[PDB]
């Protein structure tokens with residue numbers, strides 16, 4: 001009777017996922033006859049791979065990644081834009097005192113294994129005249145903070161200003177960073193709801209029912225900021241990704257601004273954003289097969 | 302002219318790679334007309350993946366992985382067994398007090414992101430009477446120790462008894478474990494030298510040149526345990542994977558036993574081991590395409 005839908009988040013639960021949990025808790029999905037199954041990823045890259053393979057119909061990923069994916073012939077399609085601008089920043093301990101991304105040359109940068117991180121770091125490094133081919137990336141999965149703090153990596157990319165940054169500071173670490181948009185990286189959407197082609201064609205109803213629900217979750221979160229932030233926190237995976245309340249409210253405050261759609265409903269996708277993100281990548285030889293903005297995303301409403 | 306050959310290590314430099322750095326320092330590779338360039342993986346799955354694609358001609362991986370890779374149609378082939386038995390142990394802080402792998406049900410286990418670990422853990426958990434679907438894997442790439450020491454993970458797999466075990470202990474952690482061999486897993490070769498089919502066909506004289514120099518380095522190590530281990534430590538990656546004199550010589554003591562072919566030459570393989578490991582993976586439904594032991598490995602000399 002209830003349509004069961006698997007939704008794989010992009011990371012372990014945190015402020016950015018608030019709208020989804022509010023949807024669950026308020027029965028918005030039940031009202032829509034859906035049984036939403038929120039799932040965490042085993043590997044950071046699972047979201048796009050599983051969605052692509054058709055194993056799961058929904059997940060949260062990164063716009064630049066969707067393009068990378070579609071460029072490799074994966075049938076991944078963005079059906080909604082959650083965070084309309086970047087969150088990703090390159091981080092390191094203040095003692096490192098790097099002058100610019102070009103100082104990463106000859107050093108090792110930790111990262112979650114997520115591909116999107118390659119074009120971002122490459123652009124940032126070349127933008128400063130360094131030779132990215134001498135920059136060493138070290139996959140640390142979810143252990144982003146530990147890579148930098150332990151010392152095994154000189155810097156990290158994949159960390160968010162709305163999260164990892166305030167957490168490290170809260171934990172006492174003195175963190176400095178480089179903002180990708182100050183080094184040739186476009187204002188891409190950090191996070192987008194993604195599905196696969198078949199499911200968009202074969203199950204448009206379910207997808208429409210889902211977003212309608214998720215949107216109510218969003219609108220409710222917006223009108224009930226604190227209350228909704230409380231919902232997430234209680235639903236946090238305390239065993240593997242414990243959250244700090246103060247850190248999370250600050251995170252939410254940042255995300256709210258970036259999640260809101262100035263000239264349309266929450267989730268509305270801007271064709272301009274995609275077009276330039278594709279050309280940015282296509283320009284740096286990251287796209288093996290051509291990608292078109294009319295195919296990288298579609299409206300499920 | 303020296304024949305350039307890229308060799309990707311399975312992990313960062315440690316006791317197990319001593320025979321290779323010895324063959325470089327002592328000039329054995331040069332003697333065989335080759336210029337060997339050791340490269341570290343940025344991603345734990347790189348070895349198998351870059352070899353398969355032809356991007357790299359040589360690398361170190363795991364016997365079960367070669368099978369899985371071939372099961373996925375990748376053209377990789379094992380050209381030498383380096384560590385003839387398992388090293389992989391599931392590890393957790395002594396606090397946990399698990400009675401068996403079935404206690405892992407409902408918890409999260411960290412792993413390097415290397416596929417071979419899924420079949421291992423699943424077999425283990427199932428042998429102890431637990432539901433694996435209820436076990437959560439968390440990708441931490443190279444940050445294995447951190448996953449459990451930070452409490453972010455309840456247990457970890459992928460860690461080696463010759464390295465991580467003595468390291469955690471040396472760092473002050475009371476570690477407990479579960480040997481996969483005690484829980485239905487076969488005595489597979491932990492480390493094996495790999496190449497792709499195309500290369501073994503086109504560059505066999507190179508491979509043979511490379512392996513003689515390698516055998517020579519290996520034999521020197523056996524006659525000069527300590528001098529070799531020092532060659533290794535001086536050639537360690539101190540910035541991203543610092544080593545401890547004591548743990549590393551302890552590690553060598555373990556590997557010396559597992560690397561030696563009691564009767565036969567170093568690197569020698571045989572259908573038996575491969576067929577056993579293949580059958581294991583088929584029985585537990587891990588293979589997609591059937592795999593043939595014969596095609597899975599081949600002598601290099």
Ligand SMILES: Cc1ncc(CNC=O)c(N)n1
Pocket residue numbers: 010011014088112114116117157158159160163164
């Ligand atoms: C809180 C947080 N941190 C890092 C990531 C990883 N994204 C790109 O590398 C993510 N999805 N969420």
Ligand SMILES: Cc1ncc(CNC=O)c(N)n1
Pocket residue numbers: 311312315389413415417418458459460461464465
């Ligand atoms: C020292 C060490 N630790 C872990 C691994 C990873 N193997 C399987 O996951 C490895 N190749 N070497």
